[PDB]
Each structure stands twice: as C-alpha cells, then as structure tokens.
Amino acid sequence: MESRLLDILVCPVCKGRLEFQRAQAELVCNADRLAFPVRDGVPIMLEAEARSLDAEAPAQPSLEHHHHHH
C-alpha cells in the first residue's frame, strides 16, 4: 500500500492534528486549546513552555527607572 498524507505532527497527548498558524508561529492543539511555538525553525513541543489560548505569556521587561551609562 502507498501512503500519501500531509499528517506529520499530531499532539503527543491528545493525538489531535496540530493547526499551524502564522500569528506567533504556533501549532495549535485543536482540542486542548494549546499552541506549540515555532521559535524560528525550532518548534517547542513542550506544553509547559508553550502558549495556550486560555493562558497567555505575560512579558513586561522591568518597568523601572534604572540607572545606566555608568
């Protein structure tokens, strides 16, 4: 038998096919509401270090009047 398929990556937990978006470059787990981020070529298939549609990543780099130059 000859196999064709465009099915390369399924969710390692739910076994649901990943949904490749180009917003933040994410593979959305279309059942768990998760999204594995593709960090320019390298996809992070780690759920804890990925992003969710329920839980976004809060990133605000030090809101402070910090002394610089010297």
Curated annotation (Swiss-Prot):
Classification via Pfam families: Trm112p (PF03966)
- What organism does the record attribute this protein to? Bordetella bronchiseptica (strain ATCC BAA-588 / NCTC 13252 / RB50)
What protein name does the entry list? UPF0434 protein BB2007
* Taxonomy, superkingdom: Bacteria
Family per UniProt?
Belongs to the UPF0434 family.
Any GO CC annotation of this UniProt entry: cytosol
Give the InterPro entries listed for this entry. Trm112-like (IPR005651)
